[PDB]
Amino acid sequence: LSKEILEELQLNTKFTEEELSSWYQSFLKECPSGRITRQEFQTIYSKFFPEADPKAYAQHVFRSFDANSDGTLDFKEYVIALHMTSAGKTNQKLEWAFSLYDVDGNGTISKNEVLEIVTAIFKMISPEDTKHLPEDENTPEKRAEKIWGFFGKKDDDKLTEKEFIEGTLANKEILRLIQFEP
Ligand SMILES: [Ca+2]
């Protein structure tokens, strides 16, 4: 690691520098490069969520962090990705839920895009639990809709980042929706 990346990581986690270091060493033993590939990263999720199709979701999470598209996530970005994938910190989290959702990366979210992640996210719910799901929103096609709803202005065209951070922050109903299993 590097001193700066050790703190950007410790001031984004309840992880100690000492821990982030032991971690690195372990990570480096599997990726001597100090960087991890989408292929590899995807496996991480297929392993710990055997009861679903994490493949899709994982790929999206991956794209959301691999900034300057090298097809690889390095330790730092990789770490903060394993985070905004579990639960907890949610603002430091929703300031990323936009990145995950603005799939094509421009600067605005579409109805398809919302539906693409809602579905990918859905494919992660063990079929078992797929049922304990509040019917109004218990299928991809639905939830996507019970979301593009709150953001009103059903443009069936666009949703800027302003309206996203506001709707998410304002009403915590969409926040619960748009986001994964915390
Ligand atoms: Ca977009």
Say how many Å lie between the CA of residue 16 and the centre of ligand 1. 36
End-to-end CA distance of the chain: 29
Q: Has 113 been labeled as part of a binding site? A: yes
CA atoms of 157 and 170, how far apart (whole Å): 22
Classify domain 1-89 by CATH architecture: Orthogonal Bundle (1.10)
Q: Has 136 been labeled as part of a binding site? A: no
Q: Has 163 been labeled as part of a binding site? A: no
| Burial class of residue 29 in the structure, from the number of CB atoms within 10 Å of its CB (0-12 exposed, 13-18 middle, 19+ buried) | exposed
Residue type, 144: A
Q: Which residue do the tokens 């096609």 mark?
A: 141
CA atoms of 83 and 98, how far apart (whole Å): 16
Are 101 and 178 in contact, with CB atoms under 8 Å apart?
A: yes
Are 5 and 76 in contact, with CB atoms under 8 Å apart?
A: yes
Evaluate the CA torsion angle 117, 145, 91, 101 in order and state its sign. positive
CA atoms of 140 and 56, how far apart (whole Å): 13
CA atoms of 34 and 56, how far apart (whole Å): 24
Residues with CB under 5 A from ligand 1 (ion): 102, 104, 106
CATH 1.10.3720.10 fits 90-182, yes or no: no
The method recorded for this entry reads X-ray
Listed in order, the ranges of the chain carrying CATH 1.10.238.10 are 1-89, 90-182
Say how many Å lie between the CA of residue 82 and the centre of ligand 1. 23
Length of the chain in terms of residues written: 182
Residue type, 3: K
Residue type, 54: P
CB atoms within 10 A of CB 176: 12
List the beta bridge partners of residue 73.
36
CA atoms of 13 and 163, how far apart (whole Å): 28
What secondary structure letter does DSSP report for 160? E
Whole-angstrom CA distances from 160 to 99, 165, 166 are 12, 9, 10
CA atoms of 106 and 141, how far apart (whole Å): 23
Are 66 and 77 in contact, with CB atoms under 8 Å apart?
A: yes
Whole-angstrom CA distances from 151 to 32, 54, 128, 135, 164 are 44, 27, 30, 20, 7
